[PDB]
């Protein structure tokens, strides 16, 4: 399938190389971790790469299932 990249280019769903069997959604905190919450760096991965402390990652196998929720003014 294809995944969007918030961490590399701007944001576009491009097919990924061999290895990541699906897409994913990571979250954490940018350079200063502001009050705007964390970021939303989805992309590709072999499997839900979630880990231990605050690395909150997720997955996405449907078509363009990596569109985090943010396009909307308060």
């Amino acid at each position: 399938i294809v995944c969007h990249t918030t961490a590399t280019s701007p944001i576009s769903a491009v097919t990924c190389p061999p290895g990541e069997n699906l897409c994913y959604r990571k979250m954490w905190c940018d350079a200063f971790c502001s009050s705007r919450g964390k970021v939303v760096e989805l992309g590709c991965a072999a499997t839900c790469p979630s880990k231990k402390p605050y690395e909150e990652v997720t997955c996405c196998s449907t078509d363009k299932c990596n569109p985090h929720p943010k396009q909307r003014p308060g």
Partner: peptide, 13 residues
């Protein structure tokens, strides 16, 4: 300027 969890269009500041 990010795709943070509160907007998507690259914001300046």
């Amino acid at each position: 300027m990010r795709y943070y969890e509160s907007s998507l269009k690259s914001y300046p500041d």
